[PDB]
Design a protein around this ligand. Structure first.
Ligand SMILES: C/C1=C\CC[C@H](C)OC(=O)C[C@H](c2ccc(O)cc2)NC(=O)[C@@H](Cc2c[nH]c3ccccc23)N(C)C(=O)[C@H](CCCCN)NC(=O)[C@@H](C)C1
Ligand SMILES: Nc1ncnc2c1ncn2[C@@H]1O[C@H](COP(=O)(O)OP(=O)(O)O)[C@@H](O)[C@H]1O
Ligand SMILES: Nc1ncnc2c1ncn2[C@@H]1O[C@H](COP(=O)(O)OP(=O)(O)O)[C@@H](O)[C@H]1O
Ligand SMILES: Nc1ncnc2c1ncn2[C@@H]1O[C@H](COP(=O)(O)OP(=O)(O)O)[C@@H](O)[C@H]1O
Ligand SMILES: Nc1ncnc2c1ncn2[C@@H]1O[C@H](COP(=O)(O)OP(=O)(O)O)[C@@H](O)[C@H]1O
Ligand SMILES: Nc1ncnc2c1ncn2[C@@H]1O[C@H](COP(=O)(O)OP(=O)(O)O)[C@@H](O)[C@H]1O
Ligand SMILES: [Mg+2]
Ligand SMILES: [Mg+2]
Ligand SMILES: [Mg+2]
Ligand SMILES: [Mg+2]
Ligand SMILES: [Mg+2]
Lengths: 371, 371, 371, 371, 371
């Protein structure tokens, strides 16, 4: 019975049932359309490949995301993905379960609103709830206090929570995220002749990133050692068997998370952003935040990113403050896990917005909150 | 068995049992409410943190006092504190013990009245009595004659007693007290960039005051020496590890007790106030008052305040009169101790106002007196 | 001949000559540095655009203020601005005129001190004087009695003056100011998809604010009417021709001046702050303060802010007290005008601190006062 | 009932009925006219021998093709051949069946156009369709993905198809084909005195080619071994009983398919052409193309041509890519078979262009496509 | 004296002296080798025809470019061309002049690097500098602000510059260029029987393109009018006197610059690419970019391409933004002219990289920049 938990992210979709210890359906939020000789109808063929299908057929498809920086732009393709989950991956009659959805804070109200509408009308959902991803991530850690740094492909955001009592006043959001890192790699790999321009090629670059990139603890001295050939130089085999050799880029791309100016992102680096949000809060809180820096999301899966982070924050902070980062394994699922927790939680059941309530109240109901 | 003694002050609450040599429960009279995103209900959470709880969670709470200058303004929060004592700190069934309460002289009758009502009705107290704090302080000293200068956060007051036979005609009261000293520090620390504005921040300033402030024996020459860096300059570490450096303020704040004009308090300084109350009394008494100046209360815990006081009074008085100040250690508990004494005293048992008596007589009974 | 008057505010700089009926040089206190490909030297180019220059080139510059909440933090950029005025906007040999400077009360002494030093040493100023902005504002109104509420970008402050004889004891200062209003708009506009994050974008938001925001006389009922589309919904054209539509935000942002809790500013609203400062003063004064509430500063240029203010204070005050607000046109220049007045005033000439005096006395001289 | 399938190639004509497992009529696309003493009329005699007739009477006829490199040049002779099929070889009333025709890609539009016209007007065809030969060949193999290399007498061409979704963007065409191989033999046999110059003689050379030529796996070392007499030296008996002995030419002629420069064909060899078309496609596709190289057409009937091909492509490709060639028996009929398949296919019936449609629309209709 | 300016493009080479108002040597970057009977040695003959020589002898040569999409692939042939310029076309002792070279942005570092090496070692160049072509083009226009769209045979690229201060963050590059247009013509002319396959034939097609192709302002309606014979149908005489008639192709080929999907180029059209780069930049800049769209390069020499461009961008942009294209005559030389300007510029002389510096520093020096 129970409910569904759906991490409808900007990168990919993680869906499963509340109470599960992991998602059952994990696939990319991509819809692919035929590039050459536009479509054939009565043969079936197909012109809308989704997720792993799009991956399989990738070479001849135009890969589009529906989501841009946390915003659902292409609601039609979004709908297709929802359908694909419910009927192809989980294969369960939507209307039999409540649906827990998640989102990044500070989204345009229209996203929460219209998305809700669709769930109720198109999919006949019985009840649903929308939660902030960072909050859920904290639940997964089991801490009641800390800063949650959650970062994916569309956005990066920071939420500070103190023994419950989340502090809305200091929530921050950056457009700097995984897709920018990927784009930077396209630009940087160009230095060595490795031109990538199509959406299929973008995907390949992503694969590279996720396997070879790492965070240097000292980018300047990393670059210094990079003057000599070493373990930095690492091969990668393409889909067609050709081999790529990557050097400085292994960490120069991750560097942009601390040196955002590289891509024209005139803003603070992550470590600065974090530090600043601490400064924005009451001095009596700061201490506990320093010792409870929760990190989650796929873009925190770079080797040594936590260590680099700790180092940098320690430098910014007063020497007497203990800087400690909470960054368990399975950070990719942190949000989903948090969702499973709350959905299984007894108290939480009062939160469900039923379709009945929606119909009686209307759209605005999605912004309510109480526990 | 016996009774309870409760120093329900303006700063904090000191409670224990009659006959104890010290309070068992000592905590600040503060109720804290959530600043950000107003409260959550069914999770419990809590929206009313009291005393040390308020301290622990201070950063996200609005700290309010129920008492202003000795007057109970917020009876609801007052009630909460009473509850907290009885059930969380002492953890004793109120109705099993008589309760000795204390107050500053010249309060509005409604305080004594309504407070009494609550004790009898809400807490089902069996018997109670309200005493003047200064009087109790004298009992703690064990003297039968002297002037009691008792000063806390809300008020400062002077009572002169001569071999018993307290002299109501010359009781004096000032609004100048600990909270004004704290406020002055906020204003003075601003000179060095140390801005404090929230109630949490107020609390921090208090902590500073109580550790670093002292009374100069000669403020003018203290300021003279302050021209050069010295031991006057003293560091202080904040909750978040940042360090504050304080100089002149170490004593400039305490100076306001002798130079009240600094804060617009158009009145006499403490030493003058004392001297004047002596002048207000019969010349045959004056002598003994000069040699028995009892000092108590938390705002007399500044280093050298007694010595400064003695000096100043000596200057005002005739040279042949021996000026002697009685200022033992544990001045913070003087009143409470006095309460313990009388509550244990055999004779005193006749003073108890029983709920029965109250019910038979009514409110006005709280103003009776005889020994 | 005569002297110069310089309103070196937190927002912008208004400079002119004493005796002028208006500033000759009005431009923002901003220094802009090249974002992309850090600078070119021998071509000149320029890497320090100031004021209107920074505005013109805004898109590719990092806009920084030197002043934060009334405090000069970046003295180098501050110096650049001073230079720009004297040599580019007024184009007058600094050393030929005395300089009247202004500041918010309760600043760290180091500001007045170091600023003075620079004027004398770097710019070879002959004589100078520093005055409190609120005081000057009163002079512009021509009243001898009233409360001056002056509010800009960095700070908001309240000074009460009674027939001269300014009352230092009740001067109040808030960090809540124009920059917070702007930041709140960034956060609130996000609700509609209008993301602004760069310093260039901040500037755009400011422009919006200053043209479309207004104060509702009843925010609750304003929000009620806001349920329906109306004149509340107002278009705005961006620099690139795109059009923005703004609704509730038109007044929800101004609301924070009365409901500071919206941004976590745990303090009183303006109307409360004012009322409280009146309560802090002697009851014989209060009457005249009620009938003489002087309002000035750029953040008082919201439509209906005076009317809203009057309403709220009237509610707080006793019904028999006549609440009257003094809020002429040209409130933006009130301080500067006051400066012109005093600088032209005969009596006032004795106030000038000459460089000679400074050299003979030293820094501390800047805190003298007598008329 | 059903329809007809006609492989009207550049070499010969293969006709049969849809659903047949083989053509019923297979004969060369040749029209022969009397060389000596131009024709006799009223005796009948005949001056237009077609196909096998032309073969039988070959010695005294001028053999002409109507098709040159896939283009129909002599429409009159073309018409004669169509007639011969329908009335002499299949012997079926044209108008009773739909006709599936085939062609090489990138033909001049006029071929498809005018040919269509003739079918409808001269032969009163009810419905027809024109398909690309390579595509049909793939259908015969039954694969959904692969590269089809189809090569006959007039042209050689390459089409890459990926799970349907044929990729028009990388279709390639070469003039290098069977007729060039034949011409090269005429030139090479001349080295040994074997002069062939007439069209009858050309035909003989073709016969030789098709029986004795083979592809060496290593032409250089084949030539090395050719220094000694061996099995390379092979006899051939002419129509008049004379015997020809052929040596190096057995494989030197086939070599031109990999070494086209031999005949001045300044272009890539077949293996290079294939490889390049793979390079022209998306890297995500390349893999499957490598493992699915479909080969068809009469000029792929040389012994060992597949093995030689595989070898060469393997050399060009990355070592990790599995190079596999699909080259079943009956490659000569692959296209025809594919035609039979689609014509029998249910879905495909919608493709038929009826004469009615043609009359209502006009010529341009022949370029439509949808499934 | 002075220096040399060399537009070593992907199409052709334009060389002259700094300060000249035009190139002195203009010829194609082609090396031709004998197709038939590979070479004769001691007779001289020649096997390496360059530029106009290759043109003259074209029929019997294999024409190869050294450059592919901006990348130097055949360094040997590249060297030959350099030689040909210096000793046959300009006929000047290389080592006597500094050499200004140009390139497309985002090239592999190895190009700049190795090319530099050769200049210094093989040709003993005294000093040299490498500049971005688009930047130079802007200098030729004389504007300080604008977008430079520069497009040749190998690449198309976009650089946006704002009052100097070039914006590296938004530089874009497309593989879509002149050679693709030529290839498309080969494919499209095939529709009418006009088969072109050799490198000599490629060259002929180029000649056609450059004389007859034009950009339609409305391709759909152009195609509509193309249904009737008109001025669209235009004759062309080949080298051997045969005449070609071209119709739709006159503009269908140019259409691919706006409809890149025609050749499988899954990317934005030029007008979209431009528009998008504007969107990528700060909103305060956008305005000036809209009104200053600089266009240069040989592939912008199609009739009406500017007008078509303007139309399309205007459609994409907001109606209030003035869209203006800067497209003077002599766009083919824009880059070269810019080079002449800077080389003659006094300030610029500091930019020269001397061989001495190179020897002392090494390869990496070529990536320095400052003015
Ligand atoms: C352009 C502009 C206003 C135009 C908005 C357009 C007219 O209306 C839209 O719809 C915009 C559309 C929209 C979508 C859906 C909807 O239901 C409602 C709005 N969100 C966006 O465009 C946002 C996109 C965005 C990125 N992170 C965000 C975070 C929150 C909100 C939006 C964004 N967005 C225009 C910008 O970010 C860009 C980039 C600025 C930050 C640098 N990366 N810059 C601006 O916005 C400023 C300049 C003003
Ligand atoms: N091993 C990895 N190393 C670094 N980054 C990764 C790794 N795996 C994933 N990522 C980044 O995280 C992105 C998605 O993670 P996620 O946070 O789940 O996105 P979203 O939450 O929007 O679905 C990936 O697409 C990639 O950009
Ligand atoms: N070490 C100290 N030095 C100076 N002042 C102190 C010290 N400790 C406490 N105080 C002052 O005394 C105040 C409270 O003392 P107390 O007289 O008990 O208040 P109350 O009697 O109203 O409860 C403190 O809050 C502070 O203002
Ligand atoms: N028309 C307006 N409406 C509302 N607020 C305004 C208006 N014009 C200016 N402001 C606010 O006043 C600010 C600056 O005014 P000012 O008081 O002069 O600042 P400062 O005194 O620090 O220079 C502006 O930057 C803006 O925040
Ligand atoms: N046994 C063979 N070996 C080699 N080549 C052959 C053989 N048989 C036929 N061919 C070549 O194939 C040519 C025709 O095959 P085909 O592809 O059917 O031509 P088309 O498809 O144009 O009708 C023959 O005429 C000959 O050139
Ligand atoms: N009249 C013309 N019309 C259209 N395109 C032309 C014309 N002349 C040249 N081109 C195109 O421009 C190409 C080369 O111009 P150019 O930009 O100088 O190349 P590159 O800069 O790489 O040397 C030509 O080879 C051709 O593709
Ligand atoms: Mg996520
Ligand atoms: Mg006390
Ligand atoms: Mg001001
Ligand atoms: Mg065939
Ligand atoms: Mg060029």
């Amino acid at each position: 019975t129970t409910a569904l938990v759906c991490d409808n992210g900007s990168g990919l979709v993680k869906a499963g049932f509340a109470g599960d210890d992991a998602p059952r359906a994990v696939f990319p939020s991509i819809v692919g359309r035929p590039r050459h000789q536009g479509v054939m109808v009565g043969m079936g063929q197909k012109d809308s490949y989704v997720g792993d299908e799009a991956q399989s057929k990738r070479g001849i498809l135009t890969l589009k995301y529906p989501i841009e920086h946390g915003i659902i732009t292409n609601w039609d393709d979004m709908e297709k993905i929802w359908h694909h989950t419910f009927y192809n991956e989980l294969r369960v009659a939507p209307e039999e379960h409540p649906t827990l959805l998640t989102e990044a804070p500070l989204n345009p109200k229209a996203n929460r609103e219209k998305m809700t509408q669709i769930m109720f009308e198109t999919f006949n959902v019985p009840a649903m709830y929308v939660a902030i991803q960072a909050v859920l991530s904290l639940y997964a850690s089991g801490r009641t206090t800390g800063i949650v740094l959650d970062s994916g492909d569309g956005v990066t955001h920071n939420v500070p929570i103190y023994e419950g009592y989340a502090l809305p006043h200091a929530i921050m959001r950056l457009d700097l995220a995984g897709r920018d890192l990927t784009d930077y790699l396209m630009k940087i790999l160009t230095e060595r002749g490795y031109s990538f321009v199509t959406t299929a090629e973008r995907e390949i670059v992503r694969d590279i990133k996720e396997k070879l990139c790492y965070v240097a603890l000292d980018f300047e001295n990393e670059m210094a050692t990079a003057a000599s050939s070493s373990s930095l130089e690492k091969s990668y085999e393409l889909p067609d068997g050709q081999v790529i050799t990557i050097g400085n880029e292994r960490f120069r791309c991750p560097e942009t998370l601390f040196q955002p100016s590289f891509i024209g992102m005139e803003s603070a680096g992550i470590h600065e952003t974090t530090y600043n949000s601490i400064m924005k809060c009451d001095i009596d809180i700061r201490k506990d935040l320093y010792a409870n820096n929760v990190m989650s999301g796929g873009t925190t899966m770079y080797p040594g990113i936590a260590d680099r982070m700790q180092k940098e924050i320690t430098a910014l902070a007063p020497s007497t403050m203990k800087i400690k980062i909470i960054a368990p394994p399975e950070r990719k699922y942190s949000v989903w896990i948090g969702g499973s927790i709350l959905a299984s939680l007894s108290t939480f059941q009062q939160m469900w917005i039923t379709k009945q309530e929606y119909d009686e109240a209307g759209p605005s109901i999605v912004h309510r909150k109480c526990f």
